[PDB]
Amino acid sequence: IPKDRRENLQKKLFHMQQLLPNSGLPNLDRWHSLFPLDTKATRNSTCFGYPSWMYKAQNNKNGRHFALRRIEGYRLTNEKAILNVTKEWKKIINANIVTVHEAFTTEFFGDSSLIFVYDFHPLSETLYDHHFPPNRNTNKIPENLLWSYVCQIANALLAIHNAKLAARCLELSKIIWENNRIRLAACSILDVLHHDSPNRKTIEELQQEDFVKFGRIILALATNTPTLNFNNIDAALATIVPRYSTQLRGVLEWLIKPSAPGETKTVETLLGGITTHLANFANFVMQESDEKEFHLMRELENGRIARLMFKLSVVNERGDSHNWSETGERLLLKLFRDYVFHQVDADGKARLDTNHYLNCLSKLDASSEEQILLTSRDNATVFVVSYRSIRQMLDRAYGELGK
Amino acid sequence: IPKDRRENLQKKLFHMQQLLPNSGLPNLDRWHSLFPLDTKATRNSTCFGYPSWMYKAQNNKNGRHFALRRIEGYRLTNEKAILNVTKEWKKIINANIVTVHEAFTTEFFGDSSLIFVYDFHPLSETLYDHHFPPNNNTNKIPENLLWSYVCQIANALLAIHNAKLAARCLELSKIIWENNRIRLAACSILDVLHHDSPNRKTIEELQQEDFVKFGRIILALATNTPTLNFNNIDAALATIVPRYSTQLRGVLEWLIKPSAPGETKTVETLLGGITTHLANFANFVMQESDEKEFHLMRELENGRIARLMFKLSVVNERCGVHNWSETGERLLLKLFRDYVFHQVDADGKARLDTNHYLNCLSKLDASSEEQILLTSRDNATVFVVSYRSIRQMLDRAYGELGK
Amino acid sequence: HMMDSRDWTQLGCVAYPSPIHPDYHAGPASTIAFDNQDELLWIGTQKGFAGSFIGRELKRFTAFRIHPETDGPLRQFLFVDKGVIFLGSRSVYMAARSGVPIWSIRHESMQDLRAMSFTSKGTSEILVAGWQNKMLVIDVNKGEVVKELPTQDQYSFLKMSRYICAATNKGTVNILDPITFTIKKQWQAHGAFINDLDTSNDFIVTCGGSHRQTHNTPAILDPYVKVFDLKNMSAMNPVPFAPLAAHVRMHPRMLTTAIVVNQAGQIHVTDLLNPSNSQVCYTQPQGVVLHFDVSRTGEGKALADNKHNTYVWGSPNKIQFTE
Amino acid sequence: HMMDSRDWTQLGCVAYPSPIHPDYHAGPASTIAFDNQDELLWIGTQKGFAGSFIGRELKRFTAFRIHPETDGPLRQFLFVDKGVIFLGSRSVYMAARSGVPIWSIRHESMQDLRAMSFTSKGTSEILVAGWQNKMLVIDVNKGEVVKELPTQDQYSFLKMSRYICAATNKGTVNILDPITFTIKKQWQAHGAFINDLDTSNDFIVTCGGSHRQTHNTPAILDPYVKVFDLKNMSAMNPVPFAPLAAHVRMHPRMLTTAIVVNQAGQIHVTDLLNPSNSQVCYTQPQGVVLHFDVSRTGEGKALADNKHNTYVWGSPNKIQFTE
Numbered sequence A: 001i002p003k004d005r006r007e008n009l010q011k012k013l014f015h016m017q018q019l020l021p022n023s024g025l026p027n028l029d030r031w032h033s034l035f036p037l038d039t040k041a042t043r044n045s046t047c048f049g050y051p052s053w054m055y056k057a058q059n060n061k062n063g064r065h066f067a068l069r070r071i072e073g074y075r076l077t078n079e080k081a082i083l084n085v086t087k088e089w090k091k092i093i094n095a096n097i098v099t100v101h102e103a104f105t106t107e108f109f110g111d112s113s114l115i116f117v118y119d120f121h122p123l124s125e126t127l128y129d130h131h132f133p134p135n136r137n138t139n140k141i142p143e144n145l146l147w148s149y150v151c152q153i154a155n156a157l158l159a160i161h162n163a164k165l166a167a168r169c170l171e172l173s174k175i176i177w178e179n180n181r182i183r184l185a186a187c188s189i190l191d192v193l194h195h196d197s198p199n200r201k202t203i204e205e206l207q208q209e210d211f212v213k214f215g216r217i218i219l220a221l222a223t224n225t226p227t228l229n230f231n232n233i234d235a236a237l238a239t240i241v242p243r244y245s246t247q248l249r250g251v252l253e254w255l256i257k258p259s260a261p262g263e264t265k266t267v268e269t270l271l272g273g274i275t276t277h278l279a280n281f282a283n284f285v286m287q288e289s290d291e292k293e294f295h296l297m298r299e300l301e302n303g304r305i306a307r308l309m310f311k312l313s314v315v316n317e318r319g320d321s322h323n324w325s326e327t328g329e330r331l332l333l334k335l336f337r338d339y340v341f342h343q344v345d346a347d348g349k350a351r352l353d354t355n356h357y358l359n360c361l362s363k364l365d366a367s368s369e370e371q372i373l374l375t376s377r378d379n380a381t382v383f384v385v386s387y388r389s390i391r392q393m394l395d396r397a398y399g400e401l402g403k
Numbered sequence B: 001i002p003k004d005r006r007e008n009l010q011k012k013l014f015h016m017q018q019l020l021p022n023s024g025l026p027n028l029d030r031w032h033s034l035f036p037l038d039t040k041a042t043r044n045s046t047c048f049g050y051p052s053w054m055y056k057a058q059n060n061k062n063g064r065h066f067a068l069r070r071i072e073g074y075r076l077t078n079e080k081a082i083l084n085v086t087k088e089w090k091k092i093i094n095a096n097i098v099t100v101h102e103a104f105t106t107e108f109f110g111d112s113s114l115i116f117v118y119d120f121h122p123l124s125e126t127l128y129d130h131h132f133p134p135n136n137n138t139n140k141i142p143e144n145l146l147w148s149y150v151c152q153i154a155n156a157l158l159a160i161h162n163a164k165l166a167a168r169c170l171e172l173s174k175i176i177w178e179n180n181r182i183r184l185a186a187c188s189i190l191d192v193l194h195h196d197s198p199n200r201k202t203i204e205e206l207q208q209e210d211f212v213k214f215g216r217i218i219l220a221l222a223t224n225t226p227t228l229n230f231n232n233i234d235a236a237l238a239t240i241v242p243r244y245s246t247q248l249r250g251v252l253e254w255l256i257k258p259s260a261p262g263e264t265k266t267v268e269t270l271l272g273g274i275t276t277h278l279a280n281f282a283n284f285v286m287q288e289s290d291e292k293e294f295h296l297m298r299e300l301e302n303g304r305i306a307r308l309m310f311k312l313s314v315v316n317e318r319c320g321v322h323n324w325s326e327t328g329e330r331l332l333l334k335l336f337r338d339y340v341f342h343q344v345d346a347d348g349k350a351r352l353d354t355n356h357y358l359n360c361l362s363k364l365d366a367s368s369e370e371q372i373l374l375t376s377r378d379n380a381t382v383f384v385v386s387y388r389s390i391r392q393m394l395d396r397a398y399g400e401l402g403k
Numbered sequence C, D: 001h002m003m004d005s006r007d008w009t010q011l012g013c014v015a016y017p018s019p020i021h022p023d024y025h026a027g028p029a030s031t032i033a034f035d036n037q038d039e040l041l042w043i044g045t046q047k048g049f050a051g052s053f054i055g056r057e058l059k060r061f062t063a064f065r066i067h068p069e070t071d072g073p074l075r076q077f078l079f080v081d082k083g084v085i086f087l088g089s090r091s092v093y094m095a096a097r098s099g100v101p102i103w104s105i106r107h108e109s110m111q112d113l114r115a116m117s118f119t120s121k122g123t124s125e126i127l128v129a130g131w132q133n134k135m136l137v138i139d140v141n142k143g144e145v146v147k148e149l150p151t152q153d154q155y156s157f158l159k160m161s162r163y164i165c166a167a168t169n170k171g172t173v174n175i176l177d178p179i180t181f182t183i184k185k186q187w188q189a190h191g192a193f194i195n196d197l198d199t200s201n202d203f204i205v206t207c208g209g210s211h212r213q214t215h216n217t218p219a220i221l222d223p224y225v226k227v228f229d230l231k232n233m234s235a236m237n238p239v240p241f242a243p244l245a246a247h248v249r250m251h252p253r254m255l256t257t258a259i260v261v262n263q264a265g266q267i268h269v270t271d272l273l274n275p276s277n278s279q280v281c282y283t284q285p286q287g288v289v290l291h292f293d294v295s296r297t298g299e300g301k302a303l304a305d306n307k308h309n310t311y312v313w314g315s316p317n318k319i320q321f322t323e
């Protein structure tokens, strides 16, 4: 377990139970402890056509945190509209799609609002807020990280299109990001809002539109222009051929340009091109997943290391005496304690060695058959004893204290 | 973190330091504490053509554990043979390939032997020993899990073929398995053995053979025949068409049958078929990788609590003091140590309380502003101090010792 | 005019050092002072123990030794936001009110310090001196000696108001410029010694006598308080005090009023500008009163006696030591 | 016959307790013994420290106190597979060779133990005795006293061979039935004391003298070893030893041969069946020799002297203490 990830995982926990007492926010029927998640105080909503507010809140029934997406000022004209779509999207669970749970209407905010409830992914920044934060930078986003994004969105689109649905909302600002893990965080919002809007399109025509927005989202990041426009696409496209691969340029070209009237488009055919890259993404994910696996051991072991640290600290400063066997054991422990924590070189300078402190305690944790040298102050007493023996001596000493 | 997941990580650490004191086994030049990993006392080598022995061993220099592959009775005809191949394979790092480091020859075992050294992957069972255990039965292997295997090997083959190498050894017993993560564990072995053999083949036709062995390994698991043969393949192939998907049936067929003389074969073209499955495999990994990330949060607290236990045990019992602040500081810590671990009831019996030990260290972990009562023996000195202060005194005390 | 008991009563008492205290054998309190925050009263022992007590009922808070016990008595307290500053004969110590050490200074020129005060720099700097011919200037923030000054006059007391008022061990008062530490004026207060000094921006008040104790002559306190006008820099008429004036404090709210105490625990509250109007009251010490202080609000009065007792007096109706 | 120097040389030496040992002031070693495994030599101090040393060069191995230091000297060792048994005057202790405690027995009837031996039960049981009128039987496996027996004679030595051979503090030897501990035969070896006893299945050999030390008379060792035939149960002719016989051990491989040592460190190796052939050799002890033992193989000979030195002598050609 390194230094940076240890803080990264710590900040994730501080973020979850983080509260604002002066929030002046309500408590709804099913929720409480609301928390403003919006960084940008002034609000215009990229795709909703209304204003949007983001809240963290605890459920009442189970007490776990969820992300709330508040649509300020919507009129629930049809109850059919909501339940028609929350049922379908709730079924879709993907690693790159922020899972949507229910959707209800509440009036507590002081106005009529439509409320979507999502998974809470702490320390998520939007994809926008990450690669272009407000406050120069000419660094281009490295092609590999661009390919990871193609795959993760392709994975998300593959799921969405199979449920015979469409993303509808697919934008740089509506995609959260966490340690390079991007997820669609605005799904199912526009299904309700354009449920009975004029000029409704086919889900078959929406799915085709999902590819164009997709192509644009990447092309933006390539040319480092967070706001892109269909007016200059072709000019942008020429600018990526020297900074990036000819392969990538074709993928964007395919994704953005409309297909020949016979062909149609599907996620499958996108995946066919990027075969090599999907495998590399798969390889990275796995390796990261294994890296996590190691840490989940050493940090679970630390918990065990600590319970032993306790039992030791209890016996080694308590003196009260019966028979001589006790006097032998009680000495060995103090000498064991000195061997680890009180390591000193010649001239008595403190040999601090946190690797050393760990090594011994793991050996004690597993009852290692390795034997160490224990020495007294006057060098009178000398032991040659294995960790397995010492551990048993400790567990016994601590055990008798409780009787 | 559930019950079994806590056990898997527990057994994994137990497996690492597992030792046999009764071992009739040696200590080599660079290694020691060897450990027999072999289940079957009876020995046949699936692909080597010699007898094989497997050892876990600690390095002497860095003290970390490695997996050793012992080839019994080998002569080392060419020094060119080893270094021509350990260098190239050492470069290949894959999530599905057990990394090979060096290869040396030792005679300590009582015979001339060739030793390959690998990564140690604790709790590994072979792919054979897992799906076909020596106890049995019935039951079908779920198709999805068959697809997981196709992808992981394809990923593994992709790396090797791109390095202009070949797998050479690709069999059910020469693939370890851990929580559905399969890896090629016999890599680089056959490169040395056939280095200056009579009937050496093209590296390009060896690569073509890799697809066919692959076809055998999956079809084996498909038809549930741990030993399969090209003698009845076409008949074997038909038996899976109702039990599994038509898609899978073609893939095996593709891998097995010799290609049309113009076509050749590549991993790339396999991936063209399995596009949808690749996305699904990645998706699973990610979700599982996210699952660990949650667990790695709850258990990270253990890492610091233990880190504090170290500093506490180190500063104490360590010597006159220069200035007077030291006598004040050195006193508060010693009195604090008594408040936590040496709590005594009326009449002085040891009040053991493992909850209390935790509570205080958590309060110390977050620098809680709660105040506790610290008192001296003669009741002359009396402190009223918060955990936050003590933590600062500890960090300084431990800090000053190393200077 | 006597004081109505509804405005003046004994509110609490404590023994410090008590019989089970390691310093009991060494004698009564060496000094007392009201903190300027957190409702604390501080008491020093003859071996350098500091004890703190909360509120009018003097409930115990913290206690700790501030220098090696061979250094002798705790000489003085001073109070700042960060913690309490303690002066002993051989060293100066600072700790939080919690007891957490802040810094420790044991400079070679600190041989027999008796007194310290603030200067022109708020709570950032103190001046320290005693029965020795060096003074030291200390940065309270850094916890280091920043300046050493030679001195011909030896001091038993220091206090900053408009200027640093410096009582010598011969009964004279030096008025020191707080910026340069140079002497602006000398005032002959008493004949041989000064037992107490207080000052506001406009006045100095002192207690004392004509001769220090010998086997021929007990130290006798004078039947008056000497008064000096700091505003117009000239001596004033003394304030008559027949019970013999042992201690004096300026009243923190009645700005021209002094609080005067004799060894039998008799206390007078008297306006400096006109001594004709004074309120008289009495306390009940077991022994001879040795030390006295008043809280920042003026509502709490504390007195320590030679039987190791410290008493708190004031109105029974909700008095506060500080805001 | 003189010893060829190629057969006899000093192979190693150690001081125990050394000047930096906490028991140094109390005097030299109280006993020494070769372990029967792991190439160990054990040495006891006058306050109960045990030190073990490996091989002919006596590199330090382990050391630990086996009873409270006020109990005095470590009286005797015995060796079994599980560990080392330690006898002190007031208690009996057992620990692994590592120093890991196994059990501890401090029985009220243990007032001045001096000697212990095995019994009729192999290494599963021991008999303990001393200068007291009680004996105790200890189950070595269970670590408990299992039987108490009266005895009229007080003992300095115990060793099991064919029978339990028990040397009294009056110079006689009792031969005890190993099952019932009853006396089969009494032998008058020396006048007042026995300084050493060893035994094989066929022989007993002892060293001693006619009078214990008084201010009138030093204890003088007799100029012979007394010999008793255990096979045919009758006394035999003594083995002549003009340098005065201080210590004796039976040779473990030459079954009819005895090893005899005097206090100046002169050693004779003499066959009991024919005394005519004996090898004479010399050592160079700094002080007077106090203790002696031989290893199980017979190849190592150890001697401790009153100047706190312990020497190992033997052949320069790769010797082994055990199999």
Ligand SMILES: Nc1ncnc2c1ncn2[C@@H]1O[C@H](COP(=O)(O)OP(=O)(O)NP(=O)(O)O)[C@@H](O)[C@H]1O
Pocket: A037, A038, A039, A040, A043, A044, A045, A046, A047, A052, A053, A054, A067, A098, A118, A119, A120, A121, A122, A123, A124, A125, A126, A129, A173, A174, A176, A185
């Ligand atoms: N599902 C979620 N769970 C947790 N945090 C989220 C989630 N979605 C977004 N966030 C965080 O909260 C912010 C998202 O709010 P959002 O309103 O989409 O951003 P915005 O910049 O205000 N867009 P807009 O309001 O349209 O201009 C980002 O900073 C994210 O890091």
Ligand SMILES: Nc1ncnc2c1ncn2[C@@H]1O[C@H](COP(=O)(O)OP(=O)(O)NP(=O)(O)O)[C@@H](O)[C@H]1O
Pocket: B037, B038, B039, B040, B043, B044, B045, B046, B047, B052, B053, B054, B067, B098, B118, B119, B120, B121, B122, B124, B125, B126, B129, B173, B174, B176, B185
């Ligand atoms: N690199 C490795 N790290 C850790 N464990 C391994 C590794 N390789 C194999 N193992 C395990 O150790 C055991 C010995 O390996 P292996 O020789 O493959 O077994 P086997 O059944 O004896 N093969 P064979 O002898 O060819 O029939 C196997 O059961 C594996 O589960």
Ligand SMILES: [Mg+2]
Pocket: A038, A040, A042, A043, A044, A052, A053, A054
């Ligand atoms: Mg917003």
Ligand SMILES: [Mg+2]
Pocket: B038, B040, B043, B044, B052, B053, B054
């Ligand atoms: Mg095998």
